[model samples]
Target: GSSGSSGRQAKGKAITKKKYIGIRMMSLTSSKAKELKDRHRDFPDVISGAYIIEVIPDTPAEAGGLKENDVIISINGQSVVSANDVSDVIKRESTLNMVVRRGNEDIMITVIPEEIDP
Candidate 1:
């Protein structure tokens, strides 16, 4: 329930507003996680997806079974080619069935989205 806006930015990244889904992910255009995932999936052609970088503890993402290095392919049934896609849908949906690719398996992680304010 960490929902207050802050100017604090993740190193080399923009400061995103807070809702606290608890996953630190990024697109292949900008991410450290990509190099590791490439060893398995190998996204060469315009890798346009948010690479899972880190998952925060005691949060929706962790409860929903999302792990670090898990590539988020889609939010709900819509294709997620970028971080914008993930953000766009999350603001509307009460719950999200995030489809992610973990190594060789595609898993549907169910997360109940909620906003908490101070």
Candidate 2:
């Protein structure tokens, strides 16, 4: 039996949604900071901020172009000294405006957090 072919059409758009940058970070210790300073002339000897250990792909952290070994100096306009400090700001801010030290210069990155929950 051949009749006029009919096809169903359905159109649905999904709307979805950061306290979560999806990065593993470690504090920049005195020893580590000194070592970094030795390697990168741009890096300061001051022991402040957190060093990015890992950045998950497709997440806010990676979307912002953050990479491993990048040192995060501030988040949402707040200076961060450690991983915990970064977390505190991450939880409070909806949009992340980050300042990070990468190689020879400081970079500014803007990341929009994904809404994982309602």
Candidate 3:
């Protein structure tokens, strides 16, 4: 989720795309945020650092078993720190291998991309 400030600041701007998720400022008491940061530190190339945001429902990520506050570590074997990393992986690879840290356990899930049929 994005900070309320970030969201409010974006208002009245011409946005070509709609972001389905909200953002929130990082709180000192947020364990999930700290964990995500720690995990990101373990892997280099995380450009956007880490996000303590919620996952969108019924999206590709959701279908892949990702849930709100699930720290996404890697996509298709590549470390994901930024949204671009995810986009790049999904754009180039049909099959994705995602690593997520949930609670005290790390889980790996494989997702196959499907084309939308009209």
Best by TM-score: 2
What's the TM-score of every candidate structure? 0.67, 0.69, 0.52
Q: Model 3, poorest ten-residue lDDT window?
A: 19-28
lDDT of 1 by residue, 13-93 (tens): 334443558777655565444455466555323346776668889888788977875667788898887876786666667
Residue 76, candidate 1: how far off, in angstroms?
1.0
Can you list the residue pairs that collide in candidate 3? Answer: 1-22, 1-23, 1-24, 1-53, 2-22, 2-23, 2-24, 3-23, 3-24
Clashes of each: 0, 2, 9
Model 2 residue 84 CA deviation in Å? 1.0
Give lDDT tens digits, candidate 2, residues 1-118: 3335455536655554225668876657878888877886766435678877688887877978777767777888788788777766665677778888666567898887655642
Off by over 4 Å in 3: 5-52, 115-118
- RMSD vs true structure, all candidates: 7.4, 14.8, 7.4
Off by over 4 Å in 1: 1-18, 30-46
Colliding pairs, model 2: 17-114, 17-115
Model 3: lDDT equals 0.52
Position 90, candidate 2: lDDT? 60
